[model samples]
Target: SDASGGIILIIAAILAMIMANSGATSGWYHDFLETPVQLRVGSLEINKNMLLWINDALMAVFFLLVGLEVKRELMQGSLASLRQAAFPVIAAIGGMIVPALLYLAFNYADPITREGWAIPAATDIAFALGVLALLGSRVPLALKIFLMALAIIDDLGAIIIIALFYTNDLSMASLGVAAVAIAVLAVLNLCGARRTGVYILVGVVLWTAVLKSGVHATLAGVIVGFFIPLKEKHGRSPAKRLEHVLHPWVAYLILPLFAFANAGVSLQGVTLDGLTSILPLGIIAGLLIGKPLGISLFCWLALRLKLAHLPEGTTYQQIMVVGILCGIGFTMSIFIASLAFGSVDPELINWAKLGILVGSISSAVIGYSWLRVRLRPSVEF
Candidate 1:
């Protein structure tokens, strides 16, 4: 199911690109994205186009799943134990920091363009795992586990960056309201509120408050998700059950829709100058060059310092291949690019998408080829 979701995402992205580049359909496609959607309740009103709803509303649900997963991981999953988590956490940090620095190095002079420094610092876990599935049993189970842990940490980093760096237009009153709502959620948690519906209702209010707040609306999802009780009561584990229910919807529907909406890079009138633009070039370099170097180097450093060891039975060559595959940052990269430059020149956004597509494809191809050549029979090692 997970691998199929990844394939759907790729197909959606390609379809979007084809639609955007086709003369007969390009205008309609762009217009459909811009088509307005409005919701009103008495004096309260929210209005935005299709793109904003997808980016803001639907993506908030996506973040909700992310937040729930992060909570479970920290509590009992991959990130629960320090020893279990140390290597991947460190590797993810290196992966994030290096790509960002490389991006900044190229775009620092242009503050507007530099806003996308975090774009390359992400890894699409679904896509990476999908590619790994192609190698079948040739890849070690430990290596797969390592990749999952690293990608989860990578997601945590991306969430933090969005909360801190991507926010704008502070509204203290709305934030205060959101804080009060969160306080209520915490109180409900203490009072043993066991019904999922109760949390959903409060979460909707919280989402509304945070939507009006200066911070990105998605952080509300993360905050509310943490407040969801992990312990089972009345024969239900709210956090785990919710995660189980939401995972398929998020993985199959929301992510693929987002890819379709944002991944359409029309090369209609783009010249060499546009293709070589700093925003795209910086992202390309960061993903293709920075991801592998930082991941491999940090893994090496961890081994050298006795902080971590290689996954059992996996060699450095395999590690390097996984590191390169981590460069497939399509989903999160496009999400950040939208937040970073959505209001700026539309062309710049397209270029950013182009860079992501080129860099991610290059990484996937190279990583798969590397693994294909180097991965021997299981008994070889």
Candidate 2:
């Protein structure tokens, strides 16, 4: 399943690259992305380019799915216990922190590019997990679960970062509306509302309000997701139901579409110097070097302190390879790049894309090959 998800995303990206650089339709492709799109409701207006609509509006839906998953995982899944969760939680912090510092290492000199320090600090769970899934039964289930738990924690960190650093100019009135929407969501949860329709409707209002509130609208998705009543009705929790229903759509459609819309890196102007520039270079270093260093270091500490043991039948060597796998920062990294560089520097956005592609590809190749060689080739359990 993970393999199929990753493969589909790869194809989507390839198609986007082809359409983006075919020269015959490249103009059409970009024009479509930049096409002015708008919504109005009697003295109120919401406007953006087609790309912005995808980034701002549809990405909110993606974040909603993320929220649902995180909540479920927190309540009963891998993250249910501190003992079960400690290793991944600590490693995830190292994963995020080290990359940002690495990014800052290369970009701190320039204020313009420095703002993009968070670009490579995230892990793309599907891409990383898909890579692991390809190893089949040879891979330990514990290791796979560890990676998933770690990625969940990493996403929680990314969520906080987006909330903190990525807001546009503030709007007090719109924020108040958003606050009310959230309060309504909370009220519904407290009231034990089981029907999902009212929650969905209120989520829409929350999305729009946040869109106008200057906070990235995607956070609204997380908010609604958390507020949805988790208490089960007839053994069916609303959160679990929504997550199950939305998983296929998010995996097969929304994610791939977002990748296509944003991953259109034109190669015509991608010079060596361009790739080696501060922004992309920062991203490359952050993912390639910082990810493993931080993840392994933290994991090492946890083991040395006897705080967390290795996953069953897994060695530190396997953990190192998993660290490398976390560096495949595909869509989430690109999403942050858009938020960081959006409307500020078009050229830098391209550079960020180049960096992400290079860093991620290298991580994938090195991680897969290394782990394949490291594995003993048969599963006992």
Candidate 3:
């Protein structure tokens, strides 16, 4: 089942990569490559570098879901219990620290490539969750909650790494403007602004200011995500709000459009030999080998140390399957890879995207197959 979900993601990626590199009619590819795409209405206009607009502005809705999920988990889910949460946290820590170390290992001496260390850590929660969703009755509900918590924590770590390590020279004026905008946003959060429109308006301003502020601007999504009143005014939990909003936008819209816009790679002058290059290999290894090994190893250590217990009904095999499924680092991985190598060898990033497609699919397929075999005739959700 996991394999089946992974296959779908791969099918999606392969389709994109092929058309992307196909020919001049692939103007759609170029359309997404350059910026200044726009939406206009009577007396209203929205414009941005298509990449930033999609990644930072629209994807904040994704991060809003992240904020909500994190808040929800801490409030009521597996993460609500420190004992239950600790193992995933420990696993997540391993998931993060090891991949970063591996990325730095790949680029240690090349100062030019060091900025990309966080790229491999961007796990695709949708792909991962979608894989879990496929197992249906075979996988335990507790494990699903556990995976969600782990990915939320993993995303939080990745966002922080980007903000701290991947930023550029500061533009104080722009930074100041971003700060003021964020302050206004915080005030809105405090002043009983429960309207999604309020957050949307404020979030757009924050993303624009952050774009000029010399930060990756997507970091604005992370920062503004924190201020979106994760808890509703009448004590509605962030989970409920996330359920009502970001879920649909992220799963069906922002993510797929992001895939379409960013996944195009011109294979015109490229060959299969190019796909086997160091850049693609590094990314593939980070997503496949690093994610599962790091997560599993750290989880074992956490259990051995008595820091946490295994999620109920989740066997070691299931853990391993989940760890492997985490390899589907699609959307976030491709998004960061675009920003990381966008200017330097855009083609290399394309190859990396290819690897993401391959690696995520392989991981999902093998993980799902393994789980299905392990679970056998149990067909209960």
TM-score of each: 0.91, 0.94, 0.84
lDDT of 1 by residue, 7-69 (tens): 888888888888888899888998999898899999878776788767777767877777888
lDDT of 2 by residue, 1-381 (tens): 777888888888888998788888788999999899889899888777888877887678877887887788788877777687777888888988898899998887888988777788877887887777788777777888878777767765776776787455757887788889988988888887889879988998989877843235888888888888776764888788888899888889987888788888777644565467887788999999888888899989878777775457354788888889888888888877777777688778888888889899899999999888887878568
Off by over 4 Å in 2: 166-168, 213-215, 269-274, 313-315, 379-381
Which stretches of model 1 miss by more than 4 angstroms?
A: 38-45, 166-168, 212-215, 233-236, 269-274, 313-315, 378-381
Residues 290-358 of candidate 3: C-alpha lDDT, one tens digit per residue = 788888888788778878655464547677677887777777777667666765665657667777877
Better candidate by TM-score, 2 or 3: 2
Scored by CA lDDT, what does every candidate get? Answer: 0.78, 0.81, 0.68
Q: Considering lDDT, which of the candidate structures 1 and 2 is the better prediction for this target?
A: 2
> Model 2 compared with the native: what TM-score?
0.94
Candidate RMSDs in order? 2.7, 2.1, 4.1
The most accurate candidate by lDDT is 2
